[PDB]
Amino acid sequence: PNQFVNHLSALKKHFASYKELREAFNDYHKHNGDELTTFFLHQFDKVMELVKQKDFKTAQSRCEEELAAPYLPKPLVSFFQSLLQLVNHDLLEQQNAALASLPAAKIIELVLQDYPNKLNMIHYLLPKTKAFVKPHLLQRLQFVLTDSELLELKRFSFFQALNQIPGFQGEQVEYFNSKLKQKFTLTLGEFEIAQQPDAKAYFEQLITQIQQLFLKEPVNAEFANEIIDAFLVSYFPLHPPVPLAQLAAKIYEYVSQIVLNEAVNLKDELIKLIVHTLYEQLDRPV
């Protein structure tokens, strides 16, 4: 299933092919060969086996679950995310062969067609070479990030993909969040999750709190973590107009109860929680 807040850190290193990544990782093992790094390197290879058999769809599912395991070490998170990118690239190419021989500009055209739809195709440019996408092309995508009618999940995702395109490293972009009713100027390629200082500290604290309230219940921590994702996505640049502790409590109350017990829709906290939770958190995967 994976997650968003699983790395409130700096931009992960870029890998254009499987070999470079297979190397970078094996080396990490020859200098950190403990049990975990051994197991995960082992899981990493399972995926590559599927990649070789062109069973990309499955390769994508196994890769997204390794990333979901809360036991995965911080440094090994960027390795898998890089794998997922290569995989999704191969998946898109096989579903849209036309993509195999097209320059970035033409690829962007296909990504914009049935407008909201097809935005996922933008993921085909991530594993490209750092010189494959000139910086001027960014201006053609701008309108997507400022569309007042676009679902926050689609816009955030679209933004998180651009954020990873080498060619746009350092560029600034306008981003409009419809929930906060205001646009922002953000820099691409600097951070994994580039939220403003306050919003970053707010979510950092919110994650630690639900983690502490669900210390006995690891399954419940996962459900609460999903809710935290929905809020991070829906208010992305910043954070919801909610007193931190109050959010943590209702998130706790909400999942604690759902394991059989009727939550109270009268409470504004549960209401907004439900309006966001996933009702606005669904979108077709790559």
PDB file of C-alpha atoms in Angstrom, residues 69-243:
ATOM      1  CA  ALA A  69       6.444  -2.393   5.660  1.00  0.00           C
ATOM      2  CA  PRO A  70       7.077  -0.188   8.732  1.00  0.00           C
ATOM      3  CA  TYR A  71      10.161  -2.292   9.342  1.00  0.00           C
ATOM      4  CA  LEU A  72      11.882  -0.938   6.231  1.00  0.00           C
ATOM      5  CA  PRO A  73      14.981   1.140   7.177  1.00  0.00           C
ATOM      6  CA  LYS A  74      15.070   4.823   6.197  1.00  0.00           C
ATOM      7  CA  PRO A  75      18.025   4.540   3.762  1.00  0.00           C
ATOM      8  CA  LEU A  76      16.479   1.578   1.924  1.00  0.00           C
ATOM      9  CA  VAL A  77      13.293   3.527   1.231  1.00  0.00           C
ATOM     10  CA  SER A  78      14.798   5.570  -1.582  1.00  0.00           C
ATOM     11  CA  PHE A  79      16.067   2.402  -3.304  1.00  0.00           C
ATOM     12  CA  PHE A  80      12.598   0.929  -3.678  1.00  0.00           C
ATOM     13  CA  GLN A  81      10.987   4.212  -4.630  1.00  0.00           C
ATOM     14  CA  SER A  82      13.531   4.335  -7.473  1.00  0.00           C
ATOM     15  CA  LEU A  83      12.603   0.781  -8.451  1.00  0.00           C
ATOM     16  CA  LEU A  84       8.895   1.631  -8.529  1.00  0.00           C
ATOM     17  CA  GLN A  85       9.668   4.482 -10.898  1.00  0.00           C
ATOM     18  CA  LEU A  86      11.545   2.208 -13.343  1.00  0.00           C
ATOM     19  CA  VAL A  87       8.755  -0.351 -13.082  1.00  0.00           C
ATOM     20  CA  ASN A  88       5.949   2.192 -13.701  1.00  0.00           C
ATOM     21  CA  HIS A  89       7.936   3.505 -16.662  1.00  0.00           C
ATOM     22  CA  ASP A  90       8.066  -0.005 -18.141  1.00  0.00           C
ATOM     23  CA  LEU A  91       4.411  -0.512 -17.342  1.00  0.00           C
ATOM     24  CA  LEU A  92       3.328   2.695 -19.102  1.00  0.00           C
ATOM     25  CA  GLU A  93       5.467   1.929 -22.153  1.00  0.00           C
ATOM     26  CA  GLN A  94       3.963  -1.513 -22.565  1.00  0.00           C
ATOM     27  CA  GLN A  95       0.441  -0.105 -22.310  1.00  0.00           C
ATOM     28  CA  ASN A  96       1.231   2.830 -24.596  1.00  0.00           C
ATOM     29  CA  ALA A  97       3.916   1.604 -27.021  1.00  0.00           C
ATOM     30  CA  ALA A  98       3.734   4.981 -28.788  1.00  0.00           C
ATOM     31  CA  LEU A  99       5.703   6.273 -25.787  1.00  0.00           C
ATOM     32  CA  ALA A 100       8.844   4.289 -26.658  1.00  0.00           C
ATOM     33  CA  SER A 101      10.077   6.740 -29.299  1.00  0.00           C
ATOM     34  CA  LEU A 102       8.904  10.179 -28.249  1.00  0.00           C
ATOM     35  CA  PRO A 103      10.636  13.295 -27.005  1.00  0.00           C
ATOM     36  CA  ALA A 104       9.528  14.835 -23.716  1.00  0.00           C
ATOM     37  CA  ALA A 105       7.442  17.522 -25.419  1.00  0.00           C
ATOM     38  CA  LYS A 106       5.329  14.982 -27.283  1.00  0.00           C
ATOM     39  CA  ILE A 107       4.998  12.812 -24.191  1.00  0.00           C
ATOM     40  CA  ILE A 108       3.651  15.800 -22.288  1.00  0.00           C
ATOM     41  CA  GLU A 109       0.988  16.222 -24.983  1.00  0.00           C
ATOM     42  CA  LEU A 110      -0.356  12.728 -24.382  1.00  0.00           C
ATOM     43  CA  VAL A 111      -0.355  13.403 -20.625  1.00  0.00           C
ATOM     44  CA  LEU A 112      -2.669  16.393 -21.092  1.00  0.00           C
ATOM     45  CA  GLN A 113      -5.273  14.897 -23.478  1.00  0.00           C
ATOM     46  CA  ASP A 114      -8.362  13.596 -21.585  1.00  0.00           C
ATOM     47  CA  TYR A 115      -7.123  16.191 -19.057  1.00  0.00           C
ATOM     48  CA  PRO A 116      -7.779  14.899 -15.570  1.00  0.00           C
ATOM     49  CA  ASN A 117      -7.306  11.392 -16.925  1.00  0.00           C
ATOM     50  CA  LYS A 118      -3.914  10.391 -18.315  1.00  0.00           C
ATOM     51  CA  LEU A 119      -2.072  12.572 -15.794  1.00  0.00           C
ATOM     52  CA  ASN A 120      -0.559   9.339 -14.453  1.00  0.00           C
ATOM     53  CA  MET A 121       1.398   9.032 -17.703  1.00  0.00           C
ATOM     54  CA  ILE A 122       3.652  11.779 -16.390  1.00  0.00           C
ATOM     55  CA  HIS A 123       5.442   8.980 -14.471  1.00  0.00           C
ATOM     56  CA  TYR A 124       7.081   7.820 -17.690  1.00  0.00           C
ATOM     57  CA  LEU A 125       9.484  10.824 -17.551  1.00  0.00           C
ATOM     58  CA  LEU A 126      10.860  10.130 -14.082  1.00  0.00           C
ATOM     59  CA  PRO A 127      13.329   7.346 -14.904  1.00  0.00           C
ATOM     60  CA  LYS A 128      14.527   9.210 -17.994  1.00  0.00           C
ATOM     61  CA  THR A 129      17.991  10.758 -18.202  1.00  0.00           C
ATOM     62  CA  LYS A 130      18.558  14.075 -16.487  1.00  0.00           C
ATOM     63  CA  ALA A 131      18.833  15.749 -19.887  1.00  0.00           C
ATOM     64  CA  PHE A 132      15.732  14.246 -21.451  1.00  0.00           C
ATOM     65  CA  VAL A 133      13.419  16.989 -20.206  1.00  0.00           C
ATOM     66  CA  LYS A 134      14.358  20.614 -20.915  1.00  0.00           C
ATOM     67  CA  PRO A 135      13.249  23.105 -18.229  1.00  0.00           C
ATOM     68  CA  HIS A 136      11.097  25.245 -20.537  1.00  0.00           C
ATOM     69  CA  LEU A 137       8.526  22.423 -20.821  1.00  0.00           C
ATOM     70  CA  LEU A 138       7.530  23.035 -17.224  1.00  0.00           C
ATOM     71  CA  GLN A 139       5.478  26.046 -18.346  1.00  0.00           C
ATOM     72  CA  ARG A 140       3.140  23.721 -20.250  1.00  0.00           C
ATOM     73  CA  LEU A 141       2.205  21.842 -17.080  1.00  0.00           C
ATOM     74  CA  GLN A 142       1.656  24.910 -14.906  1.00  0.00           C
ATOM     75  CA  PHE A 143      -2.076  25.165 -15.546  1.00  0.00           C
ATOM     76  CA  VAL A 144      -2.610  21.721 -14.013  1.00  0.00           C
ATOM     77  CA  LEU A 145      -1.216  22.778 -10.652  1.00  0.00           C
ATOM     78  CA  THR A 146      -3.440  25.890 -10.574  1.00  0.00           C
ATOM     79  CA  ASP A 147      -6.729  24.393 -11.716  1.00  0.00           C
ATOM     80  CA  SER A 148      -9.263  25.356  -9.052  1.00  0.00           C
ATOM     81  CA  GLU A 149     -11.543  22.432 -10.041  1.00  0.00           C
ATOM     82  CA  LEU A 150      -8.943  19.647  -9.823  1.00  0.00           C
ATOM     83  CA  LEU A 151      -9.155  17.120  -7.000  1.00  0.00           C
ATOM     84  CA  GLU A 152      -6.389  17.788  -4.460  1.00  0.00           C
ATOM     85  CA  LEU A 153      -5.097  14.188  -4.717  1.00  0.00           C
ATOM     86  CA  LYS A 154      -4.632  14.403  -8.480  1.00  0.00           C
ATOM     87  CA  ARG A 155      -2.862  17.787  -8.173  1.00  0.00           C
ATOM     88  CA  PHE A 156      -0.574  16.718  -5.302  1.00  0.00           C
ATOM     89  CA  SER A 157       0.384  13.480  -7.050  1.00  0.00           C
ATOM     90  CA  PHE A 158       1.045  15.360 -10.267  1.00  0.00           C
ATOM     91  CA  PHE A 159       3.194  17.726  -8.300  1.00  0.00           C
ATOM     92  CA  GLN A 160       5.125  14.964  -6.515  1.00  0.00           C
ATOM     93  CA  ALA A 161       6.045  13.514  -9.883  1.00  0.00           C
ATOM     94  CA  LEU A 162       7.275  16.808 -11.361  1.00  0.00           C
ATOM     95  CA  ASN A 163       9.208  17.337  -8.110  1.00  0.00           C
ATOM     96  CA  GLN A 164      11.259  14.325  -9.170  1.00  0.00           C
ATOM     97  CA  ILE A 165      12.059  15.303 -12.741  1.00  0.00           C
ATOM     98  CA  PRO A 166      15.837  16.061 -12.962  1.00  0.00           C
ATOM     99  CA  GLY A 167      15.332  18.615 -15.717  1.00  0.00           C
ATOM    100  CA  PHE A 168      13.115  20.701 -13.380  1.00  0.00           C
ATOM    101  CA  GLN A 169      15.479  20.611 -10.381  1.00  0.00           C
ATOM    102  CA  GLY A 170      15.457  24.096  -8.882  1.00  0.00           C
ATOM    103  CA  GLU A 171      12.555  25.477 -10.940  1.00  0.00           C
ATOM    104  CA  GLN A 172       9.697  27.322  -9.225  1.00  0.00           C
ATOM    105  CA  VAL A 173       6.022  26.564  -9.830  1.00  0.00           C
ATOM    106  CA  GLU A 174       2.672  28.010  -8.792  1.00  0.00           C
ATOM    107  CA  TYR A 175       0.462  25.620  -6.821  1.00  0.00           C
ATOM    108  CA  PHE A 176      -3.163  26.270  -5.909  1.00  0.00           C
ATOM    109  CA  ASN A 177      -4.812  24.366  -3.076  1.00  0.00           C
ATOM    110  CA  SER A 178      -8.613  24.612  -3.318  1.00  0.00           C
ATOM    111  CA  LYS A 179      -9.042  23.666   0.346  1.00  0.00           C
ATOM    112  CA  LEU A 180      -6.897  26.567   1.565  1.00  0.00           C
ATOM    113  CA  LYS A 181      -8.176  28.872  -1.179  1.00  0.00           C
ATOM    114  CA  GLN A 182      -4.777  30.280  -2.125  1.00  0.00           C
ATOM    115  CA  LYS A 183      -1.836  29.655  -4.437  1.00  0.00           C
ATOM    116  CA  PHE A 184       1.813  29.207  -3.453  1.00  0.00           C
ATOM    117  CA  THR A 185       5.219  29.390  -5.109  1.00  0.00           C
ATOM    118  CA  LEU A 186       7.127  26.145  -4.614  1.00  0.00           C
ATOM    119  CA  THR A 187      10.562  24.909  -5.598  1.00  0.00           C
ATOM    120  CA  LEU A 188      10.930  21.546  -7.369  1.00  0.00           C
ATOM    121  CA  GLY A 189      13.590  18.930  -6.649  1.00  0.00           C
ATOM    122  CA  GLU A 190      14.640  20.132  -3.209  1.00  0.00           C
ATOM    123  CA  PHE A 191      12.503  18.089  -0.831  1.00  0.00           C
ATOM    124  CA  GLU A 192      10.523  14.864  -0.734  1.00  0.00           C
ATOM    125  CA  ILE A 193       7.274  16.554   0.369  1.00  0.00           C
ATOM    126  CA  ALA A 194       8.096  20.276   0.105  1.00  0.00           C
ATOM    127  CA  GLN A 195       5.648  21.786   2.598  1.00  0.00           C
ATOM    128  CA  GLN A 196       6.121  25.111   4.378  1.00  0.00           C
ATOM    129  CA  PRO A 197       8.061  25.058   7.707  1.00  0.00           C
ATOM    130  CA  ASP A 198       4.967  25.240   9.907  1.00  0.00           C
ATOM    131  CA  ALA A 199       3.065  22.568   8.016  1.00  0.00           C
ATOM    132  CA  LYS A 200       6.112  20.312   8.177  1.00  0.00           C
ATOM    133  CA  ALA A 201       6.451  20.614  11.968  1.00  0.00           C
ATOM    134  CA  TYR A 202       2.680  20.200  12.379  1.00  0.00           C
ATOM    135  CA  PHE A 203       2.582  16.888  10.488  1.00  0.00           C
ATOM    136  CA  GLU A 204       5.826  15.753  12.104  1.00  0.00           C
ATOM    137  CA  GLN A 205       4.133  16.173  15.486  1.00  0.00           C
ATOM    138  CA  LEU A 206       0.819  14.692  14.339  1.00  0.00           C
ATOM    139  CA  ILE A 207       2.612  11.536  13.174  1.00  0.00           C
ATOM    140  CA  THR A 208       4.476  11.164  16.450  1.00  0.00           C
ATOM    141  CA  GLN A 209       1.241  11.590  18.395  1.00  0.00           C
ATOM    142  CA  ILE A 210      -0.900   9.011  16.618  1.00  0.00           C
ATOM    143  CA  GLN A 211       2.175   6.776  16.787  1.00  0.00           C
ATOM    144  CA  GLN A 212       2.197   7.183  20.569  1.00  0.00           C
ATOM    145  CA  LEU A 213      -1.568   6.745  21.038  1.00  0.00           C
ATOM    146  CA  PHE A 214      -1.482   3.515  19.008  1.00  0.00           C
ATOM    147  CA  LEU A 215       1.683   2.059  20.557  1.00  0.00           C
ATOM    148  CA  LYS A 216      -0.104  -1.157  21.524  1.00  0.00           C
ATOM    149  CA  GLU A 217      -2.125  -1.313  18.304  1.00  0.00           C
ATOM    150  CA  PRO A 218       0.113  -1.424  15.164  1.00  0.00           C
ATOM    151  CA  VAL A 219      -2.796  -2.199  12.835  1.00  0.00           C
ATOM    152  CA  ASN A 220      -4.717   0.822  14.101  1.00  0.00           C
ATOM    153  CA  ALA A 221      -1.617   2.988  13.659  1.00  0.00           C
ATOM    154  CA  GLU A 222      -1.718   2.060   9.966  1.00  0.00           C
ATOM    155  CA  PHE A 223      -5.351   3.114   9.569  1.00  0.00           C
ATOM    156  CA  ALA A 224      -4.687   6.363  11.396  1.00  0.00           C
ATOM    157  CA  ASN A 225      -1.605   6.880   9.229  1.00  0.00           C
ATOM    158  CA  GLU A 226      -3.864   6.715   6.185  1.00  0.00           C
ATOM    159  CA  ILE A 227      -6.002   9.500   7.575  1.00  0.00           C
ATOM    160  CA  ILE A 228      -2.874  11.562   8.181  1.00  0.00           C
ATOM    161  CA  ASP A 229      -1.974  11.015   4.501  1.00  0.00           C
ATOM    162  CA  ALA A 230      -5.347  12.284   3.336  1.00  0.00           C
ATOM    163  CA  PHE A 231      -4.900  15.464   5.373  1.00  0.00           C
ATOM    164  CA  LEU A 232      -1.335  15.981   4.165  1.00  0.00           C
ATOM    165  CA  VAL A 233      -2.482  15.595   0.575  1.00  0.00           C
ATOM    166  CA  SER A 234      -5.629  17.687   0.829  1.00  0.00           C
ATOM    167  CA  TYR A 235      -3.833  20.660   2.422  1.00  0.00           C
ATOM    168  CA  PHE A 236      -0.434  19.770   0.996  1.00  0.00           C
ATOM    169  CA  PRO A 237       1.531  22.975   1.074  1.00  0.00           C
ATOM    170  CA  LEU A 238       0.224  23.752   4.590  1.00  0.00           C
ATOM    171  CA  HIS A 239      -1.962  21.916   7.104  1.00  0.00           C
ATOM    172  CA  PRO A 240      -5.657  21.919   7.991  1.00  0.00           C
ATOM    173  CA  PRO A 241      -7.084  24.756  10.187  1.00  0.00           C
ATOM    174  CA  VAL A 242      -7.223  22.359  13.110  1.00  0.00           C
ATOM    175  CA  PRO A 243      -5.588  22.484  16.549  1.00  0.00           C
TER     176      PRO A 243
END
